[PDB]
Symmetry: C3
Subunit: 407 residues, 3 copies
């Protein structure tokens, strides 16, 4: 149930650390552009009206002789744009009226009739598909529509959205945002070498960002599902930025970004800070010729996934290694066998480390990992910064998702 970063390999090529070497975790370039991210669905946008037209007829049938035969019927007809709009704005003003049936217009030797045009406005809220950029309600033709004048199944009723003006069918309302782009000044701009930043995003990977069209504008979906508005005009390294990214798979869904996101960015920034002054605190200790504890060794290593360094103590000689860090899941802080599930917390138990050195009376692996008669014990700083890394993740995918409506 624990998460950790561990060198992927079970053996490393160790090399003694040279005197007065002090490496605790370039040609950077940052460009910022103006952007827009969604706050959450506001249903006030998918409000609408059911426009219903019918003719209320009073026919006066008058033949050879006899009384005045008078009838009342109702003809459901489909209204025109001007028929609805007129009766609509009267609804907006409280002047909408149902006048009822006509007075009698009677005559001789012909069956003729006089009719009234009565338009009905009933308020009606619908659903939205923000991705597919059109409205959705079962009363619609097919269950969806992308027009300002939507046809319904009933021959005589059409639907009008609360606001006829705005030309994009969208559920969520948005907020502006300044998204930063960090890349290598030296190499060609490429989707891979880019890390995205903002005040709500610490280190969002360009390698795993994909182009997604959302609420009628192109934009890009971050690794955790959050999305920013982005058009083909915004250039990075004087090259168009938008095209660099593959398109997102079908049924890819987007999350809203709350103010609650900044809370991660802060604690990541501190964990890096706490961590850094903590490995120095371990080098100061080395420098003083004070022997290193398994706790001390865990201070020195990288603790996040990616190419990094590991350290150990081989016959009093501080040794290090290059290696790539990946995320593993250990069963607890002390294992009976040095095994971890390398690809999923229900994955298989493979050996994580097998190369064991001498350490007094017990043995010691990479970054302060122990092999003791009491089992294989980890360092607590590693476990702990893994518990943070965990919470730090789940909080990123903790936002509300935009689920479209299905016709």
């Amino acid at each position: 149930y624990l998460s950790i970063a561990f060198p992927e390999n079970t053996k490393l090529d160790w090399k003694p650390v040279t005197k007065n070497t002090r490496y605790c975790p370039p040609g950077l370039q940052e460009e910022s552009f103006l952007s827009s991210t969604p706050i959450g669905a506001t249903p006030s946008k998918s409000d609408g009206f059911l426009c219903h037209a019918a003719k209320w007829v009073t026919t006066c049938d008058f033949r050879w002789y006899g009384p005045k035969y008078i009838t009342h019927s109702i003809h459901n007809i489909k209204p025109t744009r001007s028929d609805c709009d007129t009766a609509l704005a009267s609804y907006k003003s409280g002047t909408l009226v149902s006048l009822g049936f006509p007075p009698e217009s009677c005559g001789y030797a012909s069956v003729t009739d006089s009719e009234f045009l009565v338009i009905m406005i009933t308020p009606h809220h619908v659903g939205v598909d923000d991705y597919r950029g059109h409205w959705v309600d079962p009363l619609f033709v097919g269950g969806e529509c992308d027009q300002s004048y939507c046809d319904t199944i009933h021959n005589s009723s059409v639907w009008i959205p609360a606001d006829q003006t705005k030309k994009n069918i969208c559920g969520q309302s948005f907020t502006p945002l300044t998204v930063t782009v960090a890349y290598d000044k030296t190499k060609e701009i490429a989707a891979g070498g880019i890390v995205f930043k903002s005040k709500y995003h610490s280190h969002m990977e360009g390698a795993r960002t994909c182009r997604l069209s959302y609420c009628g504008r192109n934009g890009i979906k971050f690794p955790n599902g959050e999305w920013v508005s982005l058009d083909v005009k915004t250039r990075i390294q004087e090259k168009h930025l938008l095209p660099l990214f593959k398109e997102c798979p079908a049924g890819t869904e987007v999350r809203s970004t709350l103010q609650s996101d900044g809370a991660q960015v802060l604690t990541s920034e501190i964990q890096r800070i706490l961590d850094y002054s903590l490995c120095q605190n371990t080098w100061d200790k080395v420098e003083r010729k004070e022997p290193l504890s398994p706790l001390d060794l865990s201070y020195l290593a990288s603790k996040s996934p990616g190419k990094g360094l590991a350290y150990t103590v081989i016959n009093g000689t501080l040794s290090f290694a290059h290696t790539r860090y990946v995320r593993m899941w250990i069963d607890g802080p002390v294992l009976k066998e040095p095994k971890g599930k390398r690809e999923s917390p229900s994955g298989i138990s493979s050996d994580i480390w097998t190369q064991w050195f001498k350490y007094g009376d017990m043995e010691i692996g990479p970054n302060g990992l122990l092999k003791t008669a009491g089992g294989y014990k980890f360092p607590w700083h590693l476990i702990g910064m893994g518990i943070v890394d965990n919470e730090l993740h789940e909080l990123s995918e903790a936002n509300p998702l935009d689920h479209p409506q299905l016709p």
Copy 2:
């Protein structure tokens, strides 16, 4: 106005530190790890009230009769009346479903139906659907309105005081009548594998919940589904099927008192789970940073000693220095409210900021020329001073609490 966590007694039984184990407080529930076991269950927590859910309609039935009176002779005597009746279920379902489609129409009064030597009349059945939004009582599980019979109702076909009106909720399908919307959540359960499972030996964790005590958790039924209320007012749904250690879980917990209310779980909650973990960590290395000093035979400062001690309420350790021997003591920590960082008398308000300033400590040892109490508290000629780490970290522990009860509460409506 300042708080710290402090040993409950004013005196402790001190014992010298004997064996060299760097016995540091490892923030969170890692204290009892000689057999901790975690099982997680899938669950649901409230987001906050959504008013859309209490939308509804007032169904009004009426008979519009056109009477044709025709006696011995004379003109066609016609009168118009309207007879208000209570609608039937299918009547409402129809006139409502006519409304959702804009098909509902008021035909008005009937055409004239006349005859001889008898007064006969013709009627229309006119139903009106006028929109009416009501309030909800989520704990007790029913609607609430002044127009209701008794001031509340718990069915999808509610009667009103006026005999000719009934109330229907916008969505007739959903049986639980609940005001706020939910989101899913995965709650972890931690327990000692050795002991019998019980509410006492259980700690609840999630991504919004750092260490919730099972002993201070109680069963509360909410919005038509069983569940448990954590101390901070937040609530997670838990039904009786869920087993921990092959035993029913929900039953382990007592029922929450009447008029106990629940807070929503906003996402802003993670920030507590995060900065709690950071302090649990920082305090660890700081405790070590001092054990290293102990290692090196460097004399310990009053700050050094607060580094060694527990800083959260509950059974922990205290350290002091008895004539050059670093000594520890067992004690349970409580939260106190000191007036400031440096006091004129060793007195603090235990368990409440509006409490009795009582003496916090009385067992004072010699410390160069001044005296020193537990976990680096000094008795000096300048007054009684705390260490600043303890003070600052009480400031954190505080807003962690103060932020824990910071979510909105589900206040039901009280009828009539």
Copy 3:
């Protein structure tokens, strides 16, 4: 594009330290708290209302000398009385409102007489709110606005009524309780400058940039970051009225709401100051051991926030301090090729940051471990890192949504 806390002057008068005093950034302060209320965000159900339209539906019976019964139907749009609408309003709320249509016919001889029904129409109509100027806003209103529960419209026969007539001064957004603490010098006369505002959502708000603002009908104070709390003239601090100590806010000033997401700031700042202190003490300890200081060891010692503090260096092996006021500067990167930073604003004014350089290892060293090496001018990593946090804490303070009126 980076921000840091750096001493304002380019050179200071340093005095060697021999005091054995551990002056780390953590007198006669006194704290008094008052109870208050702040906006959480706009609620749209709060702006709901109704259209009352009164009209007379007349049935006239014209009957002259002779001939058939001539009957006509008309509708006269009329303006309703306050008490007339209320009749149809609670009648609307009960589903009992009815458009009865045209009256039965009342006919007679040698005179034209008519029978009429008073049909009131209630059309639901959602409107806008101006929380600042404290009145509703709509184009249908006379002039486009109104401040009463019975509002006139452009159309002579329509008035607008809000769902709840019991108006608290008509406010679009809803509020919450909050406990605001005031920190001041007990010693000095109380003044707008000497006050710092705290709460569980506000860590150290400067009272000097706070200004009195009236909002949704409650007098109050607008914090520097746009957030606002309700505050009355009754609340006294140091036995003096608090609300009046503060200037009035500029015209068209708008407020942002205060979310729980704020607590996230107040938290990391409390951890920072906890870490810094523990790290700087952790340095004094090093000096106790007479281990030479690294520029890092030195950056642990300095103030990290704008204001009167201390800066440090090491002059000919002697650890030295100086008094100075800290400001926020914007350096181009973590190591510059010229000792230049932009003082008081990120837009322009590239000034020399430091000029007083002492000998160090083989290289020269400025304040708080700033190095002048052949590779450029390197800042410590801690100082840079703490400037990155101190920054986002800023962009996150202003990260809440603000109230735009119509």
